[PDB]
Homo-oligomer: A and B are copies of this chain.
Amino acid sequence: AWKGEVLANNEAGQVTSIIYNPGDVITIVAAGWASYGPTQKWGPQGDREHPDQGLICHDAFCGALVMKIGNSGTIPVNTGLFRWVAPNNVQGAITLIYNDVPGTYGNNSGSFSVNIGKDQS
């Protein structure tokens, strides 16, 4: 299992110790407060009122927690995933990333605290 912080300004993302393998079931829980620029902060579902202006994940709001598994496209995490199985052919190291527009991470602040574990399978 892995526990760590994902900084909102970390454009490259936070690599974890989890390698997602075919058949794995995982659970993620994410908590905390972060911002994509404003003084206000939002939780791991991000800001439901902010327009998508080129987010790395178009299936989640700006300021949401997302992930990549190996060389996958981004997958929403939001507050977490409960006993979750990846799509077919998706495997590799899990990297967690704050959802923002490439090149605009510099004014970001805060972080999410995230737990990932593998479940029975």
Q: Does A102 reach chain B (CB closer than 8 Å)?
A: no
How far does the Cβ of A84 sit from chain B's closest Cβ, in whole Å?
Answer: 9
Partner pick for A27 among B30, B78, B82, CB 8 A cutoff: B82
**Complex: how many Å from CA A79 to CA B84?**
16
Q: Which residues of the partner chain B approach A23 to less than 8 Å between Cβ atoms?
A: 19, 118
User: Beyond A21-B21, A79-B80, A117-B121, is A45–B27 a contact (Cβ under 8 Å)?
Assistant: no
Q: Which residue of B lies closest to A91 (CB)?
A: B21
Q: Which residues of A in the span 38-85 have a Cβ within 8 Å of any Cβ on B? A: 40-45, 48-49, 78-83
Q: Does A105 reach chain B (CB closer than 8 Å)?
A: no
Determine whether the beta carbon of B31 is less than 8 Å from that of A41. no
Q: Which residue of B lies closest to A118 (CB)?
A: B121
Determine whether the beta carbon of B29 is less than 8 Å from that of A82. yes
